[PDB]
Design a protein around this nucleic acid. Structure first.
Length: 182
RNA sequence: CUUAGAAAAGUACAGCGCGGCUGAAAUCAUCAUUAAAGCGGUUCACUGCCGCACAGGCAG
């Protein structure tokens, strides 16, 4: 079924595929090379379980083989690759970016589990701007207003749960919207 | 390119004898330091066993 992707990239039919716009299709395969053969088609077959399972295996590898500590971990150590990678994709539309939609679904639905290990990850100011689509001066403005509460230009002073909730509260857009992915 | 050119002041030495600063005194009255204040563990060192132990040892 490796030849089916040629029809899929053309932009019609392709029932086992989500028929995204051709630009996003290309971006999706751009993601896929890093993580061109027949393995592409059946990954999207039984897609929710498959994606959740690969996220399970990556998170379990990073947690079990963690080197820093059980707590005080950083995003890159635990989720950096999968997150920081898939995020910067064309347009960033949540609905069209199926990978980011499902990643945010999983992250939000597993926030505060166990001892809130995912909701207390230390994050630096740079990745906060990357995942919020915000300026450094604006970040300084909000931290001056105490919208952001540190626990510096580049320091690990924020938390993943706080930043995610700030995105949900103040950084939702017409196309970067939660309702398009729930 | 120096009032340029050059130059050994060195040998000895006993300051010694004696001494009463003494008389007198009052420092001395009064006094309001007062007002106002978060230093903050979110989990983290738990639960069993032995021994008589406010003794001391076991494990997960």
């Amino acid at each position: 079924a490796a030849c089916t992707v040629s029809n899929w990239l053309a932009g019609h039919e392709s029932k086992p595929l989500p028929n995204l716009p051709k630009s996003y299709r290309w971006g999706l395969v751009h993601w896929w090379m890093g993580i061109d053969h027949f393995s592409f088609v059946q990954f999207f077959s039984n897609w929710p379980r498959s994606f959740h399972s690969i996220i399970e295996d990556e998170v379990e590898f990073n947690l079990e083989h963690a080197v820093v500590s059980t707590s005080e971990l950083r995003l890159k150590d635990l989720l950096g690759r999968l997150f920081f990678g898939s995020i910067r994709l064309p347009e960033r539309n949540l609905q069209h970016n199926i990978i980011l939609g499902e990643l945010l679904c999983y992250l939000e639905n597993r926030l505060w589990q166990d001892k809130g290990l995912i909701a207390n990850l230390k994050m630096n100011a740079l990745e906060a701007t990357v995942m919020l689509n915000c300026s450094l001066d604006q970040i300084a403005s909000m931290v001056e207003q105490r919208i952001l509460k540190p626990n510096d230009v580049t320091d690990y002073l924020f938390h993943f749960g706080d930043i995610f909730c700030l995105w949900l509260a103040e950084f939702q857009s017409d196309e970067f919207n939660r309702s398009f992915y729930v």
